[PDB]
Design a protein around this ligand. Sequence first.
Ligand code: SF4
Ligand code: SF4
Ligand code: SF4
Ligand code: SF4
Ligand code: SF4
Ligand code: SF4
Ligand code: SF4
Ligand code: SF4
Ligand code: SF4
Ligand code: SF4
Ligand code: SF4
Ligand code: SF4
Ligand code: SF4
Ligand code: SF4
Ligand code: FES
Ligand SMILES: [Mg+2]
Ligand SMILES: [Mg+2]
Ligand SMILES: [Mg+2]
Ligand SMILES: [Mg+2]
Ligand SMILES: [Zn+2]
Lengths: 150, 150, 152, 604, 604, 247
Amino acid sequence: MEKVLVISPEKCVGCGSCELACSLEKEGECRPSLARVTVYRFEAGANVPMTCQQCDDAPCISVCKAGALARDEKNVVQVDSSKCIGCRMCVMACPFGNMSYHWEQSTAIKCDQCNGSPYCVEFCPTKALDYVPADAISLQKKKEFSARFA
Amino acid sequence: MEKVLVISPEKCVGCGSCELACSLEKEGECRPSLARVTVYRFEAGANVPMTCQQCDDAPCISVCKAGALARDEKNVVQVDSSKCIGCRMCVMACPFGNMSYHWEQSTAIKCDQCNGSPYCVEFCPTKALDYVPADAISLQKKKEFSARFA
Amino acid sequence: MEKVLVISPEKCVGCGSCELACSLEKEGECRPSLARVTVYRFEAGANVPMTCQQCDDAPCISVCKAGALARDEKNVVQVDSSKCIGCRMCVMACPFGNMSYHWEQSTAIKCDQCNGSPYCVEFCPTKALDYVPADAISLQKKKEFSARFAKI
Amino acid sequence: MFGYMGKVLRVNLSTKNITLEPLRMDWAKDFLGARGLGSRYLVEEVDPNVDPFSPDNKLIFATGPVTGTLATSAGRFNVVTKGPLTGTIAASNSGGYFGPELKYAGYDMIIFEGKSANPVYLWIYNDHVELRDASHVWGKDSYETTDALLSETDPEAKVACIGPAGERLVLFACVMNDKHRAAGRTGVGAVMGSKNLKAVVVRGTGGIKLADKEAFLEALRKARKKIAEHPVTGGGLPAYGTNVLVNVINAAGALPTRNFKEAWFEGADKISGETMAETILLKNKACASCASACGRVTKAMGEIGEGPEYEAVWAYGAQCGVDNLEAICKANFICNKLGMDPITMGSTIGCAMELAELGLIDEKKAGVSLHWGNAEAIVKLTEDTGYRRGFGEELALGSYRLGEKYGHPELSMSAKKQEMPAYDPRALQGMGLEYATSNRGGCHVRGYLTSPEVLGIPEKLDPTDIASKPQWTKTFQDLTAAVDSLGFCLFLTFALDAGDLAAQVAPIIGREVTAEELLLAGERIWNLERLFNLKAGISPKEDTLPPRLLNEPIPAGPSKGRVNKLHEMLPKYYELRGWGKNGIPTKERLESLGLLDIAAKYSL
Amino acid sequence: MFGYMGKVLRVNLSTKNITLEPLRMDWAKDFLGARGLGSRYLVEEVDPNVDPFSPDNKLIFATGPVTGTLATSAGRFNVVTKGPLTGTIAASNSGGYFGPELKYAGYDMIIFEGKSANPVYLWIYNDHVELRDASHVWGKDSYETTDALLSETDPEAKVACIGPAGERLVLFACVMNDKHRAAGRTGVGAVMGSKNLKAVVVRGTGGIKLADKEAFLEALRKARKKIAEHPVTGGGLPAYGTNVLVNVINAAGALPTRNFKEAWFEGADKISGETMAETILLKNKACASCASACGRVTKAMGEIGEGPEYEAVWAYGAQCGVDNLEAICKANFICNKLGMDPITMGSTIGCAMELAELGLIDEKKAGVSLHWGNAEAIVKLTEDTGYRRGFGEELALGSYRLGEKYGHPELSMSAKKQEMPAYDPRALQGMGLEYATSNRGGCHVRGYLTSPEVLGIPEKLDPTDIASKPQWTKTFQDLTAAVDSLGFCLFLTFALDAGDLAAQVAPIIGREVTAEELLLAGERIWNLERLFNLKAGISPKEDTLPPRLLNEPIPAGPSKGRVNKLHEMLPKYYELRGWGKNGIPTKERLESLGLLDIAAKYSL
Amino acid sequence: MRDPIDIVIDGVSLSVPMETTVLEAAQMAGVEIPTLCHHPALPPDGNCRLCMVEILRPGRRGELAISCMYPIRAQIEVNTKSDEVIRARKFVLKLLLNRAPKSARLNALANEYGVSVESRFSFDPDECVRCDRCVRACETLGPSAIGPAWRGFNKRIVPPFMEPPRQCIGCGACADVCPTGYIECVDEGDERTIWDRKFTLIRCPICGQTYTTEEALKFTGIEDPDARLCPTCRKREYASKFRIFVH
Ligand code: SF4
Ligand code: SF4
Ligand code: SF4
Ligand code: SF4
Ligand code: SF4
Ligand code: SF4
Ligand code: SF4
Ligand code: SF4
Ligand code: SF4
Ligand code: SF4
Ligand code: SF4
Ligand code: SF4
Ligand code: SF4
Ligand code: SF4
Ligand code: FES
Ligand SMILES: [Mg+2]
Ligand SMILES: [Mg+2]
Ligand SMILES: [Mg+2]
Ligand SMILES: [Mg+2]
Ligand SMILES: [Zn+2]
């Protein structure tokens, strides 16, 4: 683990540029449905961007049997698209919904942080998505994401 | 693929109504042993409903020599009971136990999503079983987790 | 069927004790080639055992004309070795190669669940071969996989 | 016939003879099932004057016609016998998943008769029934017994067992299913342990047939909609379990505190359902096909278990004066392990505390302080009573016998020797009438008069009114008898009435069922149980309350200065019941209910 | 017959003559099989002073009486010859599935004599034995050779082959069966290569007859219960392989580090069996009829192969200072492919690193940086030694000859020219005595003194004590010799004593077999091997240890400040062995063991 | 189902069902009766007359009947080691042995019954006892290729018209069902010569092994290309389709 993605919902404005950037990088088109980050807009202008935070105890890895889910040097969980057999088991294992399934390419899809080049962070006007190095604040944000569970 | 059965085991309360609904739709009687979905009640109140998720590779199909296992236009693996010879090799091939064998009828039995009208989903009181479009498979769980941050 | 043979290739370690147990029970000696179960060891440690699963629509029964193949009361396809003339048509008809021919004894050989006491299940060290009631053929594997979600 | 399986599994523990016989369908028509049908079988086959621990006493596991089906909350079964604690007929209902599994095996009823020479347990796999030696599991608690018996029988079997308390013949022991559901009152677990029966393990892969699937599905959809819409079944029970009643009852000034010496508890907020949800509630769990999921999964004192429901919370708290929810949960876990009655255990502990308040029980003998609000006392005494060691030997006799030994039987808050469960009769007149007139002792669920008087669910009633109380009590008792016999949640009565339950039942069993038929069946069941109790030596003078309630007013709270007016409601209740001024059923009533042959048999 | 097949296959590679002869059953009685019977045949036929690469030397593939049977872990066989690395008798045990298949074809032994003019391989199909041209497969690794020979002979056959290392006459080459099982030490593979024998491919369709099937089944059930209950053979080996010993040995401070300079390795956690199970272990694999599954199937550096076992992990780990588990796994894979000794390769690499520490080896001469912990160095030098590329030409002579070439033979941690395994003699006195007295070099499983000293399997012994060590060493060596001759997992000695093994063997071979008989046979085998070694020129003065393990105490760790007291244990071992103070077997001891004819033949 | 009948075999009482042969009663009662022509899978013919037993009826003398076909419908006593039975077995065994002197089965039976070959009464020893086992096995299989072709001492089992059989299949069941080993089925490589006709054998593509001919597989009508694989190769190929998931 070198760099982590930090979500700050109190700054998000709901422009959806993160979904557009992620979908443009991954699919070659502006297709927010296939993006790995989804921004939800609630009343009183409360916007929450959601994406995989590579939680330390990852249910998706432990549930997958084909072995296509494996952590990497950056502690980022990545999908081996050639190994996936089409199960939605990782989708159900993730308690946050951050693992989706590409229904046209028939593979699980999750935030791999673009191999250290986060496009969503690049095109975030309010910096509600950041890529700060792992430290006490970064790990506290990760725990606020995953360690809350419930 | 139009719609997908989605399982949220954290919402399951272990009532077992899904098994009863499935067995009532399939066998005409309340018989949880012959249901296509099985809920397992583990310690600390952790209940897990399990059913076929229609694997895109579908290891069950690979071992069927009679051609009784085939994917439909709705991306659902289906059993042609008129071509099943009862070898029970698909039960052996399925890595999740989602393929069973009907013994009084001598056929392989698996979840077929009730041809678009899941009775397990209808009579699930906690929405632990849902039937959502494939293009939005994890959006509801992701939205629920994001609202925790709103 | 009251009870069925359940194979879990993921659990198999490739020791081959099932073949030795089956041959010791049937032929009276350790001869894995005459066992009714064969374990095949592939790359990356992927060993899968294969034996007769007593197909409810059995091609072997459908092809035999000497009347040596028949289902017993326990839904097991049985070979009457006295009625076998050695045409080997059941050997061709089995789509999985679970029917062999014992040339020395001049009879087709297939799994018979040891008439209710499988030795391969008894001497399997990893439960890759199990003997479970038919009404719970896949409950154990399903519970084992479902336990991966409960630990979450 | 549908709904019913139509088979009775009779097990003679003396001769090891296991027989299968057809179910009496005429008795099933007269007495719907479960409680009623099992009580009818017991009346037919058990002399009311036999000793509860005699081999002539019978233990009956009975299921209703709807148990194990998709009907709303249809996962319930009764344990019917003659209770050792009260001497009346004991009809113990538990849910979970054991009764549905028994009907999946293919049996409506199990009758255990005689005593087994050695500790044995019954093992049922569909049509394969065998008695197995249970010496290795004898002495273990419910959790260990369930685990071992599942390991040696089947991973997916259901176990109805007893803990160490039932083996040691504690008078308020119980039968334990799914390690957390319990058929606990009057000592049916004591009866199970006197027969040297450790557990019943059942595995079933059969199905329950319905006469009309589509009509049942429509009725089920309507019932589920009504249950979801209701504040209690829809929100309150799923959110805070049965414990949601702590604030609702304490705000009404009807929560007994410190052995009924007060009706208001100052530490109620620390033990309420909301506090439990916010502090220790891990999750909620549902019975078979229950959409309300009232069950609590909690963690306290470092142990996981099923959370204490409302009466357990009252007995170990308000009754004993403690507000430590962790200690209440731990005591409830100990009860669940050992197979004991948290209501009777807590009430006996409170009675011991009151006796020690008089300088009458030497706390050196008990080994623990008996002052009000001792959170260690409840845990230690629960363990000791579960093993009948030390002062627990005295506490195993119940509060009435504990007071009788020490010369103060009036300090026991029990009706017909069964302790009164968590609703103060001085603030709720209908609850006092129910406690006096119940068929198994100091019971609050035989008729739940708290629902109108506090929750206003059927219709809001004045808790101090006495004019309409006898009629409502009779209606509640008949409706509850019918519901118990059918196999539904009695919590279902919060959202549904007899019409909806009948609309669900009729497409299942295959015959036209109305609300009036169910009420008549419930009245018949109540009169049958009354006849059994009268022939068993329970004189109608037992239909009273301890003098503390009838004379001492409530000292403080929202219901200050109130007493119970049972003497102004009991004659009217007898008149409405069709009984005489003496409380004994009349010939005309028993003729109207078709119980003349029973009265001829009992020569009453 | 029973247990044995009674047939010996003799293949003359010089004259292309293949003959069948009966097995000497008197020698089978005295020398059970495998190592013992192979040693007896080698003593009878091979002159002890022959050059190991000469056509006069012979290579014997010998199976045990129980090999190929359902007996616990009975799938083992030995390869016996005169070792090119040490000059001693070389008895190489491999299991997998080759020995059982050799006995299924109807043979107890294969004897190879002479040298084929062209590279050939032996193809056996029951009684059909033929030599075939192996020019196409000559030069391929074990995996490619196995695949090609299976594709050209039979898919179900088993292949015992050498890799490129054996063909290049690397002194620590090996015979590879099942592409991952190795009969590797003191050459053996180099002997096979020098005879131009690429591989032996056998396909067996016959059976192995027992004497009493029922008694064997009873003993087998007892032994399986004992194995499954035992912590090591039940949970330890199947879950962490033999690599579980990494933390156990290092915690005792007995894991040699940096060419035996240190006994404690701080990078042990990264290379332990638990870490490998967590990270790279794909699955566990079992040998023929093995209840335990000590074989590791791992995936490291994008390749999949049988994971490194404990000695391999140490040799590429603590021995070289490398804490990179993936690099160790890759080096083990390269050894498996090329047919090399990971122990000898790793020890030679560590010796080269220590020589470079003294400056005697130029980093440009080696082709890679020879600093401690260089993960690239182990892989690079393993490949170079396997193909004898540049610096590999020196590494292919072993650590002793490598040190001799640079004038520093004392830096080679080897006894009798064979490098020592992962047990520091300075911390384990019994292991020091075993290394000194082993009949083929620095081997440790000739007698596994680590089991009682560390695992405490027969009895927890003090590693510092030197009093009871000689007798335990002698007993372990004789028991190990008997177990090798029978054809069992030597890991069975962790769960079974000689009683269980005898109870399994006796109903197999058809005669009353006791523990005392097995111990006597093992002692006879050990003394026969010692007579062969003494005639071959291995003087008794070579029963010593390098001066580093005798004069330099451990610098740090749990065993800090400890040396080896071999000078005090060796005379006692000689006295217990029945040998004189000069280490030569006495006439009385040979008369007791029945080895008088051999001693007269050698004129010692 | 009819009422079982109680009968006595050599002093052993037993209740056998209706329409059960004497040989079946002896088999279930542990009594051994020598047979040559009877095959449990083939329609019985009663040719060799070697399974002779004495049937003693109430008030009637013992008479010789063939145990392989004689049904038990009444109360009878069966004797298998009587002097008349022994004489009849010796006579039939002498005839059969003189017909086929090189046979191992007939020589074993003669050694059991103390019978020696006579040179004077050995007319045309051609190692065939005319038990009709091969003809019946061929008939039950489905191809009626072979058949008897003469009457009297010249009776012989031949292919039709004394030419390589045009309806033979190559299964080799006729050679398997033969007491004297008169029929020879020799396989050399990929050729099978039976009844002087050459059948091409099938080799599996990855093993080179043989278990059946091309004609047999065409006769069975099994169009699956896996049927040409040998059972071990076919089993391995099927077992490879099971993607075991090590995770
Ligand atoms: S992609 Fe599918 S098959 Fe692969 S690990 Fe994820 S859930 Fe399993
Ligand atoms: S996909 Fe979900 S479970 Fe997996 S690492 Fe990301 S957040 Fe965790
Ligand atoms: S970091 Fe990359 S993969 Fe992750 S949400 Fe942003 S754009 Fe998508
Ligand atoms: S780009 Fe930034 S501000 Fe815009 S929706 Fe995404 S997270 Fe919110
Ligand atoms: S119906 Fe829903 S809540 Fe009930 S067991 Fe099934 S999945 Fe769980
Ligand atoms: S039956 Fe099993 S393998 Fe086949 S699609 Fe369903 S889950 Fe996948
Ligand atoms: S059991 Fe039926 S569906 Fe399954 S593999 Fe066999 S033939 Fe196909
Ligand atoms: S979708 Fe239908 S078949 Fe599948 S589990 Fe639900 S009820 Fe059963
Ligand atoms: S005995 Fe069990 S583990 Fe061993 S090879 Fe057979 S099936 Fe696999
Ligand atoms: S022999 Fe083959 S075809 Fe016959 S029942 Fe067994 S598996 Fe099925
Ligand atoms: S070989 Fe035997 S069992 Fe098989 S078809 Fe032919 S006669 Fe029947
Ligand atoms: S059940 Fe019996 S016959 Fe079948 S494979 Fe196992 S040991 Fe052999
Ligand atoms: S050829 Fe053989 S089977 Fe045919 S009649 Fe002659 S002896 Fe009998
Ligand atoms: S081999 Fe030819 S003659 Fe013989 S049984 Fe078969 S089809 Fe008939
Ligand atoms: S066997 Fe009966 S007549 Fe030949
Ligand atoms: Mg009740
Ligand atoms: Mg409860
Ligand atoms: Mg060895
Ligand atoms: Mg190895
Ligand atoms: Zn083949």
